[PDB]
């Protein structure tokens, strides 16, 4: 089991860390959503699908920078939605193929009443998402850590 991004950077077997740079909508209105869709960025696969089943969860999701200060919302994961930042581990997603499959995670953040001006700065860190992978075979318990960065500034009208 190993995951990689759309620009090619990969995390090998056993877990690790990587960086992701996402393009955000330059403006968000009050009462609207800022959508951060990572199902088009992170993909993984099962190396031995004939004999092993891999289970994947979102162990933790934390907010940083402007997302922490100016936003609130939920996270979409495998048929349901949960508060973001997370308060517990999610259900499990099954990986059973050698072909890459999306990691179905998306953020839905709304501006708080104090948000105004440049809410998120370009090149800054907005979230850290931990991917926990177990299996059907042994005691392997690995963490794939993803750091999410903003590729542009986001403004909120006041």
């Amino acid at each position, epitope marked *: 089991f190993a995951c990689k991004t759309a620009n090619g950077t990969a995390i090998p077997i056993g877990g690790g860390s990587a960086n992701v740079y996402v393009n955000l909508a330059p403006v968000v209105n009050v009462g609207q959503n800022l959508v951060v869709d990572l*199902s088009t960025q992170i993909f993984c696969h099962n190396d031995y699908p004939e004999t092993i089943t891999d289970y994947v969860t979102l162990q933790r999701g934390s907010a940083y920078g402007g997302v922490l200060s100016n936003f609130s919302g939920t996270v979409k994961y495998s048929g*349901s*939605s*949960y508060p973001f930042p997370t308060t517990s*581990e999610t259900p*499990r997603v*099954v990986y059973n193929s050698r072909t890459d499959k999306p990691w*179905p995670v998306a953020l839905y953040l709304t501006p708080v009443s104090s948000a105004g001006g440049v809410a998120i700065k370009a090149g800054s860190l907005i979230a850290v998402l931990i991917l926990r992978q177990t299996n059907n075979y042994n005691s392997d318990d690995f963490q794939f850590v993803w750091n999410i960065y903003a590729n542009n500034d986001v403004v909120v009208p006041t």
Partner: antibody
Amino acid sequence: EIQLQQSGPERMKPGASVKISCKASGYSFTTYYIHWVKQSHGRSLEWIGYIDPFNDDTNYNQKFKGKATLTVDKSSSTAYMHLSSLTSEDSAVYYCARSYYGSLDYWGQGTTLTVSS
Amino acid sequence: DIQMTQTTSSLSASLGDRVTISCRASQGVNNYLNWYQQKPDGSVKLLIYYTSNLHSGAPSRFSGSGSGTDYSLTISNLEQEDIATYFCQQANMVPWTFGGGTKLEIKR
């Protein structure tokens, strides 16, 4: 308040196909998932599948793959269930429900389907 | 897929009683266990989600507890409004599965 409105009762013939709708109101339509549930005469509940309104990715029960299809129209905040090749076993009550925190927090009123010649 | 089993199909009780409905899972679920109520007219409502959390609008008589593979729903002071059928449901793995149902009855 949050409401899910389904279409009225149906009466199809064997071998036909039926479409039912569920209109959501009172919340941001694309922020949540929509699930579908079947209850047969006998009151056992069966999970059918879910669909993401944001990008239309679907997940189905293996029991219902091929027979059932889920579609969405985000312009009107409406979801659809299509069931093809109807037999007598297909007579039941079908539900739409919004999903939050792993649970089905709000349910529609249900749609009764009758398959008879 | 994960199998769900409720202890009894029917359960008699009386007004003012304390009622317990238990659910059991073939495989451990990570507290993703839900309780639903269905009235005789056929309408479904969510009572408890994530094993302990009152859904907004539910009466305070209802409570949940459990972990691993054993879960229970407790009604504190039964009322005629509570005479319904109750379902447990797990959401740890796809496909989501439901319990068989337990229908409440009035002792006589």
